[PDB]
């Protein structure tokens, strides 16, 4: 489940073949202290080809859908998840907007949704950063800095599909 890489420890943690929780940056180096039984994850090839993915998507550069490389998620829910995960259904890499909207669009408030995507099981997959409050910008666990670079990167880089027109 703990596995280092580049600058991060990412906890990845499923119960089969269905993800429910692989997240977490860099911290501590001796965090291995903190888990006394797992330090390993299986570092061969399921580890680095998903890791390799994982920092993809992060750097706006996985294209496509890209919903299933990242295995299947299942319950851990903050309160909250399951709206908002609705949402990254919808919007991609090119909107932006805050939990007002969101919450609203389905039966909600932007208060019950904010600690939803604040803990959410997976960061790297939902569309927490296209959702700030009423000024800008607005997390707590983990973003900021993240939050802001992957916001103007989305915005930068425009990929589009080949031009093939076959009549």
């Known amino acids: 489940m703990i596995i280092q890489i580049e600058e991060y420890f990412i906890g990845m943690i499923f119960?089969?073949?269905?993800?429910?929780?692989?997240?977490?940056?860099?911290?501590?180096?001796?965090?291995?202290?903190?888990?006394?039984?797992?330090?390993?994850?299986?570092?061969?090839?399921?580890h680095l080809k998903v890791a390799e993915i994982i920092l993809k998507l992060y750097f706006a550069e996985i294209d496509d859908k890209k919903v299933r490389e990242l295995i299947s998620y299942k319950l851990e829910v903050p309160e909250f998840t399951k709206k908002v995960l609705d949402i990254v259904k919808d919007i991609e890499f090119g909107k932006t907007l805050t939990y007002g909207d969101i919450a609203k669009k389905l039966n909600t408030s932007p208060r019950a949704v904010g600690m939803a995507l604040k803990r959410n099981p997976l960061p790297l997959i939902i569309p927490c950063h296209r959702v700030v409050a009423k000024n800008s910008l607005g997390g707590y666990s983990y973003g900021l800095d993240k939050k802001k670079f992957i916001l103007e990167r989305e915005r930068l880089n425009m990929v589009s599909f080949k031009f093939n027109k076959v009549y």
């Open 15 to 46: 119960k089969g073949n269905q993800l429910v929780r692989n997240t977490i940056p860099l911290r501590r180096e001796e965090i291995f202290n903190f888990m006394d039984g797992e330090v390993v994850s299986n570092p061969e090839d399921e």
